[PDB]
Design an enzyme around this catalytic site. Structure first.
Site, PDB file in Angstrom:
ATOM      1  N   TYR A  26       2.507   6.843  12.905  1.00  0.00           N
ATOM      2  CA  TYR A  26       3.037   6.931  11.555  1.00  0.00           C
ATOM      3  C   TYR A  26       2.146   6.221  10.538  1.00  0.00           C
ATOM      4  O   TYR A  26       1.091   5.669  10.867  1.00  0.00           O
ATOM      5  CB  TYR A  26       4.442   6.333  11.520  1.00  0.00           C
ATOM      6  CG  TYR A  26       4.434   4.823  11.559  1.00  0.00           C
ATOM      7  CD1 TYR A  26       4.225   4.147  12.752  1.00  0.00           C
ATOM      8  CD2 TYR A  26       4.640   4.074  10.409  1.00  0.00           C
ATOM      9  CE1 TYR A  26       4.211   2.769  12.800  1.00  0.00           C
ATOM     10  CE2 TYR A  26       4.628   2.693  10.450  1.00  0.00           C
ATOM     11  CZ  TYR A  26       4.413   2.046  11.647  1.00  0.00           C
ATOM     12  OH  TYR A  26       4.399   0.673  11.701  1.00  0.00           O
ATOM     13  N   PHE A  36       1.432  -0.617   2.715  1.00  0.00           N
ATOM     14  CA  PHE A  36       1.197  -1.933   3.298  1.00  0.00           C
ATOM     15  C   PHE A  36       1.152  -1.888   4.820  1.00  0.00           C
ATOM     16  O   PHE A  36       1.106  -2.946   5.457  1.00  0.00           O
ATOM     17  CB  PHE A  36       2.284  -2.919   2.849  1.00  0.00           C
ATOM     18  CG  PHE A  36       3.639  -2.629   3.431  1.00  0.00           C
ATOM     19  CD1 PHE A  36       4.414  -1.602   2.924  1.00  0.00           C
ATOM     20  CD2 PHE A  36       4.150  -3.398   4.463  1.00  0.00           C
ATOM     21  CE1 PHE A  36       5.660  -1.330   3.452  1.00  0.00           C
ATOM     22  CE2 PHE A  36       5.398  -3.133   4.989  1.00  0.00           C
ATOM     23  CZ  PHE A  36       6.153  -2.099   4.483  1.00  0.00           C
ATOM     24  N   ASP A  37       1.174  -0.702   5.416  1.00  0.00           N
ATOM     25  CA  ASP A  37       1.098  -0.602   6.864  1.00  0.00           C
ATOM     26  C   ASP A  37       0.665   0.807   7.232  1.00  0.00           C
ATOM     27  O   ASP A  37       0.885   1.755   6.476  1.00  0.00           O
ATOM     28  CB  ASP A  37       2.440  -0.934   7.524  1.00  0.00           C
ATOM     29  CG  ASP A  37       2.362  -0.907   9.035  1.00  0.00           C
ATOM     30  OD1 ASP A  37       1.238  -0.987   9.569  1.00  0.00           O
ATOM     31  OD2 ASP A  37       3.423  -0.820   9.688  1.00  0.00           O
ATOM     32  N   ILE A  56      13.156  -2.649  13.605  1.00  0.00           N
ATOM     33  CA  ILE A  56      14.179  -2.723  12.570  1.00  0.00           C
ATOM     34  C   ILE A  56      15.177  -1.583  12.746  1.00  0.00           C
ATOM     35  O   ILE A  56      14.807  -0.441  13.046  1.00  0.00           O
ATOM     36  CB  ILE A  56      13.533  -2.691  11.175  1.00  0.00           C
ATOM     37  CG1 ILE A  56      12.511  -3.817  11.037  1.00  0.00           C
ATOM     38  CG2 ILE A  56      14.588  -2.834  10.100  1.00  0.00           C
ATOM     39  CD1 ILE A  56      13.115  -5.201  11.121  1.00  0.00           C
ATOM     40  N   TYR A  82      14.757  -6.229   6.287  1.00  0.00           N
ATOM     41  CA  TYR A  82      14.272  -7.445   5.635  1.00  0.00           C
ATOM     42  C   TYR A  82      15.022  -7.690   4.322  1.00  0.00           C
ATOM     43  O   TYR A  82      14.456  -7.686   3.227  1.00  0.00           O
ATOM     44  CB  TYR A  82      12.760  -7.362   5.400  1.00  0.00           C
ATOM     45  CG  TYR A  82      11.959  -7.069   6.645  1.00  0.00           C
ATOM     46  CD1 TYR A  82      11.796  -8.030   7.633  1.00  0.00           C
ATOM     47  CD2 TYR A  82      11.360  -5.830   6.829  1.00  0.00           C
ATOM     48  CE1 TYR A  82      11.061  -7.763   8.773  1.00  0.00           C
ATOM     49  CE2 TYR A  82      10.624  -5.556   7.965  1.00  0.00           C
ATOM     50  CZ  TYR A  82      10.477  -6.525   8.931  1.00  0.00           C
ATOM     51  OH  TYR A  82       9.744  -6.251  10.062  1.00  0.00           O
ATOM     52  N   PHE A  99       8.807   5.410   4.357  1.00  0.00           N
ATOM     53  CA  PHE A  99       8.085   5.604   5.606  1.00  0.00           C
ATOM     54  C   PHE A  99       7.711   7.067   5.776  1.00  0.00           C
ATOM     55  O   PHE A  99       8.525   7.959   5.518  1.00  0.00           O
ATOM     56  CB  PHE A  99       8.916   5.144   6.811  1.00  0.00           C
ATOM     57  CG  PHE A  99       9.055   3.654   6.922  1.00  0.00           C
ATOM     58  CD1 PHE A  99       9.986   2.972   6.156  1.00  0.00           C
ATOM     59  CD2 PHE A  99       8.259   2.933   7.792  1.00  0.00           C
ATOM     60  CE1 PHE A  99      10.118   1.602   6.258  1.00  0.00           C
ATOM     61  CE2 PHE A  99       8.385   1.562   7.898  1.00  0.00           C
ATOM     62  CZ  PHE A  99       9.316   0.897   7.128  1.00  0.00           C
TER      63      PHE A  99
END
Lengths: 107, 48, 404, 42
Positions: A26, A36-37, A56, A82, A99
């Protein structure tokens, strides 16, 4: 509070269940348009097992609703990932998550 | 807004980019009417 | 606060040579239609997704600029106010996207067709998936120039681009009233695919640095027709008959000897006689458009004055090419307006008058609903063949200079 | 506002008739970029 929007059709029949391995190659972004990922940049298929809560809850419950080969758009509420403190140094407190998730094989 | 690059000496308020976006249902009845403009000003000559 | 950084891929845009716009004058119909074929299966080659978009953009884009951009890199169509495009799931205007709805709800995939729309009275742009409408339309533009069929692609793409009657096999039927977009081409060359705002091109030596090119405009694509001594109105028929001599000259070669029934296909003509023997609308047919031409000729700025008077009859005709004689007795014989080599201004003044004639007739054709459909463009923009006949025909009328 | 800047020239471009008049493109290419966030160029 998760929303799912299909982007490309998948098998539509085989869905992951408990006690089964899932690989997710992903990428991930933030609500404002910054990412950020990622996993494509590292070129390693991220793999995880459902049921032991090593990921999560929002991500796993989102992935539970998609089939093999499907690429979709996922949107988590800040209360599910979070919530208040967040992960220090990467994400600000009380932020919405975005995502881009697709599943390679193994259901 | 930052995406505005009209450099002309003949500028009047008619020479402002403005694009109206409308969306509706499959029935054809509209559902929103958004107008994006690259400029949000008034004319000072419209008061004196 | 800080200066973030990352990696961005590259994109490029391609458009055809066609140029459509709306203005007072020749503006076609404002109804155009095309499709496209896509067969690419590379969604995540080299990390980021493969950008693919199609749509319209006006003739002030300057977007390509390979490299940096505004949001992230030198992006393609849709991320500005000078281009309108579609990707498969979103509409892009001003670098911000909104989702769309349709049956299937998947972005561009191999083996698919998208249909765009153009209608410049509402003016608004709609799109159509392979066989179903896309629920969303743009409007309230500010149309001032022209438009490009634009495509966007990242890399590894072999899209086939559909036009129509030339070779594009339209899979589907256009809605009622839409030109297939092959008719609109510059009538001075062929059509081809070129990249917009290119400033480097390959060559036998290698790179070639090219500067800014030229382009048309709304005003350019609009025909505009141009705005007493006794001898001016005394000649009349004398110049008309001198012009009327040629009316059979090559119509002898055509073999049209005064056809009494106006044979439009079997080689005969009904107005091939003397002026009084001619039908009612045949005297001003060669004088009204000529008398006004002479009346307008003062506005042409030419330096002309009827002062030759060389015996007042020395203009002798050329005749006797075998029989060459009809039932009327005309035996056409152009006068001695042959040894008149004009002036440097007259080389263009005749052309300038010819431009007025093409423009005036263009306004007349435009008045009747643009010739009421069923093929003439503005002067200096038209073809080459039309530029040939109009010079010689008006020259014979203009060769009367220094003769009367 | 001034209508001029100084932009660099990349050393490699994207490189690239029959039925459909298809386009040709095989190789990929990428570049590194900055995102000064105050006004957002790149």
């Amino acid at each position: 509070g998760v929303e799912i929007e299909t982007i490309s059709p998948g098998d539509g029949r085989t869905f992951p269940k408990k006690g089964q391995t899932c690989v997710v190659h992903y990428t991930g972004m933030l609500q404002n348009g910054k990412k950020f990922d990622s996993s494509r940049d590292r070129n390693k298929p991220f793999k995880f097992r459902i049921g032991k809560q090593e990921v999560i809850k929002g991500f796993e419950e989102g992935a539970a609703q998609m089939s093999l080969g499907q690429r979709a758009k996922l949107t988590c509420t800040p209360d599910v990932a979070y919530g208040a403190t967040g992960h220090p140094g990467v994400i600000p407190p009380n932020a919405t998550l975005i995502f881009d998730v697709e599943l390679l094989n193994l259901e | 807004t930052p995406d505005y690059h009209q450099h002309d000496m003949n500028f009047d308020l008619s020479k402002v980019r403005a694009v109206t976006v409308t969306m509706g249902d499959e029935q054809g009845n509209v559902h929103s009417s958004l107008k994006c403009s690259n400029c949000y000003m008034v004319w000072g000559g419209d008061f004196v | 606060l800080l200066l973030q950084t990352n990696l961005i891929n590259y994109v490029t845009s391609i458009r055809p040579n066609i140029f459509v716009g709306r203005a007072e004058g020749s503006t076609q119909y404002g109804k155009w239609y095309f499709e496209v074929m896509v067969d690419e299966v590379v969604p995540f080659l080299t990390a980021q997704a493969t950008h693919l978009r199609v749509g319209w953009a006006l003739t002030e884009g300057y977007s390509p600029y390979p490299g940096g951009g505004e949001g992230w890199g030198g992006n393609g169509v849709g991320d500005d106010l000078y281009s309108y495009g579609f990707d498969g799931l979103h509409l892009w205007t001003g670098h911000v996207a909104r989702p769309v709805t349709s049956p299937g709800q998947h972005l561009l995939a191999p083996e698919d067709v998208v249909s765009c729309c153009l209608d410049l009275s509402v003016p608004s742009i709609s799109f159509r998936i392979n066989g179903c409408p896309v629920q969303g339309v743009f409007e309230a533009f500010n149309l001032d120039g022209l438009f490009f069929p634009v495509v966007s692609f990242s890399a590894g793409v072999k899209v086939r681009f559909l036009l129509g009657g030339r070779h594009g096999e339209f899979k589907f039927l256009p809605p009622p009233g839409y030109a297939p977009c092959h008719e609109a081409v510059l009538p001075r060359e062929r059509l081809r695919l070129e990249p917009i705002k290119e400033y480097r091109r390959e060559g036998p030596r290698g790179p070639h640095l090219v500067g800014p090119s030229r382009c048309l405009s709304h005003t350019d694509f609009v025909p505009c027709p141009v705005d007493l001594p006794p001898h001016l109105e005394r000649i009349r028929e004398k110049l008309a008959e001198n012009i009327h001599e040629l009316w059979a000259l090559t119509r002898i070669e055509q073999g049209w000897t005064y056809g009494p029934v106006r044979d439009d296909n079997k080689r005969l003509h009904p107005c091939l006689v003397n002026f009084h023997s001619l039908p009612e609308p045949e005297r001003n047919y060669n004088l009204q458009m000529s008398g006004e031409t002479l009346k307008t000729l003062l506005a042409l700025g030419c330096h002309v004055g009827m002062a030759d008077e060389k015996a007042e009859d020395n203009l002798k005709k050329t005749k006797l090419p075998k029989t060459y004689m009809m039932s009327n007795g005309y035996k056409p014989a152009p006068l001695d307006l042959s040894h008149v080599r004009l002036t440097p201004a007259q080389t263009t003044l005749v052309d300038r008058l010819a431009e007025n004639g093409h423009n005036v007739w263009a306004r007349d054709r435009v008045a009747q609903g643009w010739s009421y459909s069923a093929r003439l463009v503005p002067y200096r923009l038209l073809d080459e063949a039309t530029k040939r006949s109009n010079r010689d025909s008006l020259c014979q009328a203009v060769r009367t200079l220094l003769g009367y | 506002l001034m209508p001029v800047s100084w932009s660099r020239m990349p050393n490699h471009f994207l490189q690239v008739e029959r039925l459909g008049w298809a386009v040709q493109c095989q190789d990929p290419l990428t570049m590194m970029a900055l995102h000064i966030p105050e006004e957002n160029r790149c």
